Design a protein around this ligand. Structure first.
Ligand SMILES: OC[C@H]1O[C@@H](n2cc(-c3ccc4ccccc4c3)nn2)[C@H](O)[C@@H](O)[C@@H]1O
Length: 810
């Protein structure tokens, strides 16, 4: 059908068809007479999977012979989404499979919709890990993703009476064709127990044992025949566990609960024992696997030359004292040498500056669960603080500020401090974020060891986030500049010479309209809701949080509604406002925000005077597969976090690559995006970081804004009096109270500029030609935000390895 989707050769199509029929018969034990769409999906998945295995075995063989430095990316989250189409794209199989299935009388796009998302993450941090795995394979690095195979991923979100309801994400119900269980490589993990001191050092004894069973999933590079591995650990009880009889067998569930469920919190720390167990489980099993592989190449001096461990936030921070434990207690290395190895091996990436998101574990928890690790942490702390004292003599407050141990009612360990101490590199995820780290929360550490601190601006994979989800746009780009940009996104700059090209302008606008029509149809077919495809698609999709300010968006929506009600027969640019994302189950305010959005929709969508000029839709169950649908359809991307709160954002980059314009604050990666495209081509508004600081020093008074802005006053009065909740007039009292008396994120402070900026958006949208020309300038300068660039920087500046675009033999 289209160029970028590969060749459909006679030989390939014939071979695909027969292997599809083989799997249906032998693997699924079905015939065409009883087969369902689901059976057809699985036959296709198995057929494509077969094409991976040869490459997978030969890639891993290649690494064994060449013995390169290995990269271990440790994360508690891998937000993978669907795998079928991604695999076809990276193997150049999409058109061939499309043809093969067509000839069998099947629609492949229908089959693709059957696959469950692998939802083993919450949002941005989990998705970054997934994009990173794709780029590492594409860049030919010997890289392994290590995590937990959760039985239940992020919950499925249902909306009932405007409220979020959670249901279990039973993603393994029908099986996972992409994983391979590896029970032969099962490893033991220890918990509890006590420490004994002997003449021959410390020993950790009387422990409870949980088995870690690995499951391997292939990670194909883009058309380079490289297939890397994501290894996810599953918890298993040992066979003598608790071994009246029946109860002892039933009690095995206690051990196996470790890998049962993903903690559903975005940017928020919950200090529960089960979570700590998950963190150690992944770390202990992973490190044994690493050391085993290293020994199969005595001398640990070469360890940092052959191993890099990247910590995705502090969640796997126990890798630091666990590596020390192994080197000191088991390999019998002296402390100083073990520490040198550890530091040179580990690197740490921070993803937030919000105080409530920082991991601070109660000492009493670590004392019971991991008694030896606590001892090691204390020793790390003592030695680190002796270094601080020597560098800054007499500075007693610096000592208490920098300590890994926090004093108070309950003593806690600051895991971020642990990570900085035990890593050779610490990075933030966008330039402004990395600067904030050096200037504020890690200032003391930057003063002691400035060389450790780096920036690595985030990126997204252009495979999933352009070629896969937006083939129409990928194709029109390929028509002009070729296909090489797919693995070299900087080449999109060549599109600047097409900004006054009348054919290209028409094609860019055509692709967007097609995307909007397709998405408008999706909403009717699957959710029975009517939208106008000619309206401006105004979208804010991401996890619900106060810092992300979905509430500011809400205020604008109501402002637009109130202005229409005031002057009904005045022309306004029609908008479809779409807001989606999940709230953490215990996050009350976020659940209230969802209810507000739906409540506004209930008033706005049924007002006859409004017509089809304004629609407010809550996008249910936002997840990777839904992102792939809505992002290509968007006209306006809402990136409106209070300056200084969104470390980077990655959703922003997805919208930029797919032809939406951005309205946003100068926060996270928005700053670099505007810098790349030109500020004239971005809708920037609101306080900068410096303005927020000035407001904090003076004291933020929300009443001031309420008093001086009549349009804002009206909205607050509407919310208070029960305009949006007639049956329950006080339903939104918590929201109003928060806004008026304890708003950490200064919603009112940016309201006027936001509304003004939104008017400028509507003005430009009235001129289709100039809207599209600005879009082209955005797409053309989005190259920096490829995760290929990001990973190349980690490789060269942190891991000390060279990326390669060279093919492995097929
Ligand atoms: O770096 C990738 C993205 O990471 C996002 N993020 C951060 C987190 C996060 C931070 C701290 C946590 C602490 C405990 C549990 C979960 C956590 C998640 N989840 N997502 C950040 O919010 C976003 O700015 C960034 O683009």
């Amino acid at each position: 059908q289209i160029s970028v989707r590969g060749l459909a050769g006679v030989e390939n199509v014939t071979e695909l068809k027969k292997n599809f029929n083989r799997h249906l018969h032998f693997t699924l034990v079905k015939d065409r007479n009883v087969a369902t769409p689901r059976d057809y999906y699985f036959a296709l998945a198995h057929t494509v999977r077969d094409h991976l295995v040869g490459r997978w075995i030969r890639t891993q063989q290649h690494y064994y012979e060449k013995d390169p430095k290995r990269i271990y990316y440790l994360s508690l989250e891998f937000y993978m989404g669907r795998t079928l189409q991604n695999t076809m794209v990276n193997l150049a199989l999409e058109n061939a499979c499309d043809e093969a299935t067509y000839q069998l009388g099947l629609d492949m796009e229908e089959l693709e919709e059957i696959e469950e998302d692998a939802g083993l993450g919450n949002g941005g941090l989990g998705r970054l890990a997934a994009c990173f795995l794709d780029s590492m394979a594409t860049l030919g690095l010997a890289a392994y993703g290590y995590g937990i195979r959760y039985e239940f991923g992020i919950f499925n979100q249902k909306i009932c009476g405007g409220w979020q309801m959670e249901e279990a994400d039973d993603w393994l119900r029908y099986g996972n064709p992409w994983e391979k269980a590896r029970p032969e490589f099962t490893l033991p993990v220890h918990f509890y127990g006590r420490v004994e001191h002997t003449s021959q050092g410390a020993k950790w004894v009387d422990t409870q044992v949980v088995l870690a069973m690995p499951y391997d999933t292939p990670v194909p590079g883009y058309r380079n025949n490289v297939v890397n591995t994501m290894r996810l650990w599953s918890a298993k009880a040992p066979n003598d566990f608790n071994l009246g009889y029946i109860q002892a067998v039933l009690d095995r569930n206690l051990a196996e609960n470790i890998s049962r469920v993903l903690y559903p919190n975005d940017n928020f720390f919950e200090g529960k024992e089960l979570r700590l167990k998950q963190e150690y489980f992944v770390v202990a099993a992973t490190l044994q696997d690493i050391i085993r592989r290293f020994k199969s190449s005595t001398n640990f001096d070469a360890f940092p030359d052959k191993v890099a461990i990247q910590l995705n936030d502090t969640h796997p921070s126990l890798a630091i004292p666990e590596l020390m434990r192994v080197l000191v207690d088991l390999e019998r290395l002296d402390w100083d040498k073990a520490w040198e190895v550890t530091v040179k091996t580990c690197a740490y990436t921070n993803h937030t500056v919000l105080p409530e998101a920082l991991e601070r574990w109660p000492v009493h928890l670590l004392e019971t669960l991991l008694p030896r690790h606590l001892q090691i942490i204390y020793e790390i702390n003592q030695r680190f603080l002796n270094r601080v004292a020597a560098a800054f003599p007499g500075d007693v407050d610096r000592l208490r500020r920098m300590s890994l141990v926090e004093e108070g009612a309950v003593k806690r360990i600051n895991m971020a401090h642990l990570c900085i101490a035990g890593s050779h590199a610490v990075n933030g995820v966008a330039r402004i974020h990395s600067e904030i780290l050096k200037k504020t929360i890690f200032k003391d550490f930057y003063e002691l060891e400035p060389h450790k601190f780096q920036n690595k601006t985030n990126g997204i994979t252009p495979r999933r986030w352009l070629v896969l989800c937006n083939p129409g746009l990928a194709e029109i780009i390929a028509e002009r500049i070729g296909e090489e940009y797919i693995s070299d996104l900087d080449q999109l700059r060549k599109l600047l010479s097409y900004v006054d090209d009348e054919a290209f302008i028409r094609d860019v606008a055509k692709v967007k309209q097609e995307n909007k029509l397709k998405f408008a149809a999706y909403l009717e077919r699957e959710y029975k809701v009517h939208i106008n495809p000619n309206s401006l698609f105004d979208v804010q999709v991401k996890r619900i949080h106060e810092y992300k300010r979905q509430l500011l968006n809400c205020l604008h929506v109501i402002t637009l509604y109130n202005r229409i009600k005031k002057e009904p027969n005045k022309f306004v640019v029609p908008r479809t406002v779409m807001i989606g994302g999940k709230a953490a189950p215990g996050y009350h305010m976020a659940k209230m925000i969802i209810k507000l959005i739906t409540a506004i929709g209930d008033v706005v969508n049924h007002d006859p005077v409004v017509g089809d000029r304004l629609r407010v839709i809550f996008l249910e169950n936002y997840r990777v597969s839904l992102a792939e649908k809505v992002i290509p359809a968007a006209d306006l991307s809402e990136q409106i976090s209070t300056a200084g709160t969104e470390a980077s954002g990655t959703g922003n980059m997805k919208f930029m690559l797919n032809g939406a314009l951005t309205i946003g604050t100068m926060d996270g990666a928005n700053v670099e995006m505007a810098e790349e495209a030109g500020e004239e081509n971005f809708f920037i508004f609101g306080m900068r970081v410096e303005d927020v600081d000035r407001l904090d020093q003076r004291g933020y008074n929300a009443q001031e804004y309420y008093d001086r802005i009549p349009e804002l006053r009206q909205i607050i009065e509407q919310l208070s009096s029960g305009f949006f909740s007639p049956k329950q007039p006080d339903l939104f009292k918590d929201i109003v109270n928060m806004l008026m008396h304890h708003d950490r994120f200064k919603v009112f402070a940016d309201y006027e500029e936001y509304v003004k900026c939104q008017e400028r958006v509507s003005a430009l949208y009235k001129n289709p030609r100039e809207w599209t020309r600005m879009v082209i300038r955005n797409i053309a300068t989005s190259g920096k935000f490829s995760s290929d660039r990001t990973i190349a920087q980690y490789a060269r500046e942190i891991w000390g390895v060279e990326p390669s675009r060279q093919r492995l033999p097929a």
